[PDB]
C-alpha cells in the first residue's frame, strides 16, 4: 500500500496501493468503493473540501522506468470524476537521470525494488552514474507541423502536448497492451508493455507512422522473438485522436529490426509513402494506394548481409531522385526509379560507395548541394554536384562512446532554410565526474561555413528539433522545453 488517509469524521479510509485502484473503505460495515483504472499507480491521496468535497491524489506514472512521471488529480466527491488533471510532458529517457528511484514493492522488478533492494539500487545507480561514460538520455520526440503539436512516444502510449500553453492535450494508447485494461501486480511486474520505439508523421501531417517491438513473457520457449510491428493511422484537424488504418506484422521477415525510418516528401507522392532501413541493408518503400485505403509494398531493395549493425540511416533528395544510405563504414546513393545503384554514364567519379572511418550515425542533406554526415567519431560536410569535401570536425574527444547508434539521428536535425544545428554535452566535475551536466547548442549554415552561434546551457539537454516557425526546440532532463529563435 502507498497512501492512507482518514475522513474528517474518521469513518472513511482512503487507500491507494500499488495497483491503479483507489479504495474507499467505509469503516463500520467495512465496505469499499473502487476506482480501477487511473493511468498510473497512485502514491498519495487527501481530502480537501471542508465537508470533504474534493479528493486530491498524486500519481506516479512509473511505467516509464527512466522518468518517474508524476501527475496530480482532483476528484469530485460527488461523481468521483476527474475534476482536475495536471501533468507535464513525459519524455522517455534511455536511463534514469538523477535520483528517480523505483517505488517500494514486495519484490525487486524491472519497475520496482524491495527495501534492501532499494538501498542497493540507490548505491548501484550512484556508482553507475559516477563510472560509466554512456550517459545518453536521448529521447525520440516528434512534431506535427500541421498543428505545431509536440508528440512524446511514451511507453506503449503517446502524449500529445502543446508547448504554447504548456499542457498535455492527449494521451492515446496504441499497442494491444494491458496498460489500462488491467493493473500490474507483484509477479506480473516482470511483464512489460510493448515499446513503441518509433513515431513520426508524413509531411502531409494526416498520417502517423509507428514502429513497435513486442516482449513475450520470460521463461518461455517463444520468449526470445522480438515481434516487430508497423502501423499507419490517420487524424484530421477537427479531431485529436488518431485512428489506426493499416497494421503490418514483422516487415522484412521475422526478428529483423527496421530501425531506420524516413518519410516521403510531398514532391513524390504528396508524402503518402515511407522508407524503411534495416541493419541488413534492406530498404522497403511503401506508399498509400489510390483506390484502396491501405498502403502496400510499392518498392523493395532486399540485400541479405550476413553481418548485422543497426547503425543505419537514410536521407532523401528533395526531388526524390536519390537516397543517401549511411551504413556502417559506407555511404550509398540509390536511384529511386528502380532501387539500383546511382549509375552515371558520364563517369565523373560521382560514385555511390563512400568509405568512412566509423559507423555512420546520421546523413542529412541541407539542400540538393550540401550533405553533412556524422559518424561515430567525426562529422564531414561535402558537396553533391561535385564530389568535393569542404568541412570536417571531430567527435572522439566529446562523442567518443557516450551514445549507441541512432541517438545522433534522433538528436541532430536540419532546417531547410537556416542551416544545421548540432548538440554536444559536457559535465562540470570537482576533483569524479559530477552529475551536473552542461551542454552546448551550436547553429551553423551552408555545410558548416561558420558558426552562426554557440550557446552553452548550464544543464543537460536531451532533445533538439526545429518547429517550422523557424525556431529550434530543445529539452531538459526535467520536463522543461526551451527554444532558440529569431
Amino acid at each position: 500500500v502507498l497512501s492512507l488517509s482518514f475522513s474528517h469524521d474518521g469513518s472513511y479510509l482512503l487507500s491507494g496501493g500499488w495497483e491503479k485502484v483507489m479504495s474507499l473503505w467505509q469503516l463500520e460495515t467495512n465496505s469499499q468503493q473502487f476506482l480501477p483504472r487511473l493511468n498510473g499507480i497512485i502514491i498519495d491521496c487527501q481530502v480537501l473540501g471542508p465537508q470533504g468535497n474534493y479528493y486530491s491524489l498524486i500519481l506516479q506514472m512509473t511505467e516509464n522506468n527512466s522518468n518517474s512521471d508524476y501527475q496530480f488529480l482532483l476528484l469530485n466527491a460527488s461523481d468521483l470524476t476527474s475534476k482536475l488533471s495536471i501533468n507535464g510532458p513525459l519524455p522517455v529517457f534511455n536511463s534514469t537521470i538523477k535520483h528517480i528511484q523505483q517505488p517500494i514493492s514486495a519484490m525487486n522488478t524491472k519497475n520496482s525494488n524491495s527495501i534492501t533492494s532499494l538501498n542497493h539500487s540507490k548505491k548501484k545507480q550512484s556508482r553507475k552514474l559516477i563510472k560509466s561514460r554512456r550517459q545518453d538520455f536521448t529521447t525520440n520526440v516528434e512534431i506535427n507541423p500541421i498543428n505545431k503539436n509536440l508528440y512524446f512516444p511514451h511507453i506503449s502510449a503517446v502524449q500529445i502536448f502543446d508547448f504554447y500553453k504548456n499542457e498535455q492535450v492527449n494521451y492515446q494508447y496504441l499497442t494491444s497492451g494491458v496498460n489500462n485494461s488491467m493493473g500490474k501486480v507483484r509477479f506480473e511486474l516482470n511483464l512489460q508493455d510493448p515499446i513503441i520505439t518509433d513515431l513520426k508523421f508524413t509531411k502531409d501531417g494526416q498520417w502517423m507512422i509507428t514502429y513497435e517491438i513486442e516482449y513475450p513473457p520470460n521463461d518461455l520457449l517463444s520468449s526470445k522473438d522480438l515481434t516487430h510491428i508497423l502501423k499507419f493511422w490517420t487524424k484530421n484537424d477537427n479531431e485529436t485522436n488518431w485512428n489506426l488504418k493499416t497494421k503490418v506484422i514483422n516487415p522484412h521477415g521475422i526478428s529483423v529490426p527496421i530501425t531506420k525510418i524516413l518519410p516521403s516528401p510531398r514532391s513524390v507522392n504528396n508524402s503518402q509513402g515511407c522508407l524503411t532501413a534495416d541493419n541488413n541493408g534492406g530498404l522497403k518503400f511503401w506508399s498509400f494506394d489510390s483506390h484502396e485505403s491501405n498502403w502496400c509494398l510499392k518498392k523493395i531493395s532486399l540485400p541479405n548481409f550476413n553481418h548485422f549493425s543497426n547503425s543505419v540511416s537514410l536521407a532523401w533528395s528533395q526531388d526524390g531522385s536519390l537516397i543517401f544510405h549511411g551504413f556502417d563504414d559506407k555511404l550509398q546513393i540509390l536511384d529511386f526509379d528502380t532501387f539500383k545503384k546511382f549509375e552515371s554514364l558520364e563517369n565523373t567519379k560521382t560514385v555511390s560507395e563512400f568509405t568512412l572511418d566509423s559507423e555512420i550515425q546520421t546523413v542529412k542533406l541541407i539542400n540538393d548541394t550540401n550533405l553533412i554526415v556524422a559518424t561515430r567519431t567525426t562529422l564531414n560536410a561535402i558537396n553533391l554536384l561535385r564530389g568535393q569535401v569542404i568541412n570536417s570536425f571531430d567527435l572522439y574527444p566529446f562523442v567518443n562512446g557516450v551514445y549507441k547508434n541512432g541517438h545522433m539521428d534522433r538528436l541532430i536535425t536540419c532546417d531547410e532554410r537556416t542551416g544545421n544545428i548540432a548538440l554536444v554535452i559536457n559535465q562540470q566535475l570537482t576533483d569524479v565526474p559530477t552529475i551536473n551536466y552542461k551542454s552546448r547548442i551550436i547553429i551553423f549554415d551552408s555545410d558548416l561555413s561558420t558558426k552562426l552561434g554557440n550557446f552553452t546551457h548550464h544543464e543537460y539537454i536531451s532533445w533538439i528539433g526545429w518547429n517550422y516557425d523557424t525556431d529550434f526546440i530543445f529539452l531538459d532532463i526535467e520536463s522543461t522545453l526551451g527554444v532558440v529563435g529569431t
Partner: protein
C-alpha cells in the same frame, strides 16, 4: 540574432527530498474553492477550478526574486515545501499567498491580477537544519525541521510566532525526536505520529510508534510495534 529562452514547464515540485511524510501533496486550494495553486519545478500555476484551464502563471525566470532564489544554476537545493493561503503578517487582507521553500524563506506574493515585482521577502532564524514542514492552527504556527548528527534522521519541532518586527520570527523550540523512520501529521494539523529505533536498541522489535499533540499536551503516547504485531507475521 538567435536567442534562447525557456517556454514550457513540466514536473510539479514534489517534496521528494523529505521521503518521510505520507502527506506530500503540497499544492493547495484557496480559502474559496475557486482556484488551485500548484508549484512546479520552474513556475507556479493557478487554475480556476471550474473552467479547468490556466488562469495565472508565475514563472520563476520572469520574476526577479524567484529567479535569484529558485533558479540557481548551480544548486537545486531550494524548492517549495509549503503554500499558505492567508498572509502571515496582515490579519485578513484576500489574494495573498505565502510560500516556504526548502531553506527558511517566507515569500509573500499576490495572485489574482498582476504580480508585483517586489515580494515580501523574509528569512527565518535557526536555518541550520533543513525546513521539512510548516503548518498552523489559529494564530500560532508550527515548524518541523529535519536535523542530523545510522543513516537515520532526527526531527525538531518549533513554534513560530511573528509580528514583533519585520524580521523577528520567534522560534519556541517546542521539542525534538530522533531517528524517525516514518512520520505523518493529521489533516487538522493538531497531531503527529512517528516511529524510531530507540526501542529497537532497548528491545527486540525494531520500532515503536509515538503520537504527540502540537498546540497542547493532551495526547503524548508511545507504544511498541511488538504489541501491535501478530505471531503469524
Amino acid at each position: 540574432q538567435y536567442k534562447l529562452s525557456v517556454v514550457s514547464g513540466g514536473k510539479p515540485a514534489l517534496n521528494n527530498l523529505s521521503s518521510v511524510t505520507g502527506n506530500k501533496n503540497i499544492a493547495r486550494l484557496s480559502q474559496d474553492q475557486r482556484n488551485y495553486i500548484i508549484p512546479f519545478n520552474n513556475q507556479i500555476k493557478v487554475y480556476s477550478v471550474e473552467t479547468r484551464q490556466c488562469v495565472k502563471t508565475l514563472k520563476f525566470a520572469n520574476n526577479s526574486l524567484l529567479s535569484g532564489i529558485f533558479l540557481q544554476e548551480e544548486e537545486n537545493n531550494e524548492s517549495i515545501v509549503k503554500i499558505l493561503l492567508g498572509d502571515i503578517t496582515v490579519p485578513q487582507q484576500a489574494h495573498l499567498i505565502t510560500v516556504f521553500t526548502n531553506n527558511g524563506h517566507v515569500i509573500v506574493l499576490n495572485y489574482k491580477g498582476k504580480l508585483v515585482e517586489s515580494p515580501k521577502h523574509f528569512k527565518i532564524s535557526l536555518a541550520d537544519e533543513k525546513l521539512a514542514n510548516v503548518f498552523h492552527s489559529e494564530g500560532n504556527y508550527r515548524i518541523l525541521t529535519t536535523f542530523k548528527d545510522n543513516s537515520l534522521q532526527s526531527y525538531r519541532l518549533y513554534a513560530l510566532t511573528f509580528d514583533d518586527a519585520k524580521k523577528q520570527f520567534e522560534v519556541a523550540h517546542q521539542a525534538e525526536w530522533h531517528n524517525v523512520i516514518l512520520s505523518n501529521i493529521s489533516s487538522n494539523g493538531k497531531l503527529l505520529a512517528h516511529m524510531c529505533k530507540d526501542v529497537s536498541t532497548k528491545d527486540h522489535e525494531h520500532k515503536s510508534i509515538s503520537v504527540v499533540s502540537l498546540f497542547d499536551d493532551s495526547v503524548n503516547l508511545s507504544f511498541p510495534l511488538g504489541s501491535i504485531l501478530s505471531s503469524q507475521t
